């Protein structure tokens, strides 16, 4: 499997036409602060293709 191709799975809002976003800021899904790391109901925004 080639897992070196990433796509954005989580984002706070939608993109505008031809807008670029290559940030790695973690996404908070729950109401509990993730403290900018990872863990309970918060994830790294990028996902790999198998």
């Amino acid at each position: 499997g080639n897992y070196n191709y990433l796509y954005r799975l989580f984002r706070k809002s939608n993109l505008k036409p031809f807008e670029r976003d290559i940030s790695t800021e973690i996404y908070q899904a729950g109401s509990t602060p993730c403290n900018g790391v990872e863990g309970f109901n918060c994830y790294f925004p990028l996902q790999s293709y198998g």
Epitope: Y3, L9, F10, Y27, E38, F40, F44, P45, S48, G50
Partner: antibody, heavy 120, light 108 residues
């Protein structure tokens, strides 16, 4: 093309020590948290346990806490569940499932295995 | 014999819209997010809704939901004969661990 394949769904004497094994492919294994969920016949879904990618934390439902052990091997892309002190109440279709994203964790997401039947 | 509470069944005429409710404590819904699953008999369960109202790839806009107060609900519009499945409510507990509801049987 994510797949999860369970094995070990056999009929076991309650006094035994059956282990289940889930093979995983089609996604990054070593960065993802995984869960076990079981469905007893005639009932709904019952959550069993989770293990995070780095082994940083493990959680068990009280009904299996202290009697089940969850472990993973990131070099084999496989998840294991050891179930001891078995009860007839443990008869269920056991499913292997993964979380939504990398690093963190919450509940089983979109990719579920076919599961295998454990009879006690 | 579950923490999250759901009705035993739901029904309606194809083309109509129905809702499936889910209730629990502040430790289940009030302080956490609710996920929904659609389990079609004969195969594995699949995620339908996550984080209250988000959809995974492959799930159409006929499936939506919300969370308010200490309760949550799933709305299924455009009922199809292929949606005759058991819908499950789930959340992470503050005292316990992972929690699933009884499951609501939706029928034509």
């Amino acid at each position: 093309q994510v797949q999860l394949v369970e094995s070990g769904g056999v009929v076991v004497q309650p006094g035994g020590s059956l282990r289940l094994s889930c093979a995983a492919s089609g996604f990054t294994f070593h960065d993802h948290t995984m869960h076990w969920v079981r469905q007893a016949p005639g009932k709904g879904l019952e959550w069993v346990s989770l293990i995070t990618w780095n082994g940083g934390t493990i959680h068990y439902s009280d009904s299996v806490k202290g009697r089940f052990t969850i472990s993973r091997d990131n070099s084999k892309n496989s998840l294991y569940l050891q179930m001891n002190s078995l009860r007839t109440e443990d008869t269920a279709l056991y499913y292997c499932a993964k979380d939504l994203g990398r690093g963190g964790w919450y509940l089983p997401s979109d990719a579920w295995g076919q599961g295998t039947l454990v009879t006690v | 014999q579950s923490v999250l509470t759901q009705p035993p069944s739901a029904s309606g005429t194809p083309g109509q819209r129905v809702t499936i409710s889910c209730s629990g404590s502040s430790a289940n819904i009030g302080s956490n997010t609710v996920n929904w699953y659609q389990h079609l008999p004969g195969t594995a369960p699949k995620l339908l809704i996550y984080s209250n109202n988000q959809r995974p790839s492959g799930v159409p806009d006929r499936f939506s939901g919300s969370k308010s107060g200490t309760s949550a609900s799933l709305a299924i519009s455009g009922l199809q004969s292929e949606d005759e499945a058991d819908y499950y409510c789930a959340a992470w507990d503050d005292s316990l661990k992972g929690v699933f509801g009884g499951g609501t049987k939706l029928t034509v």
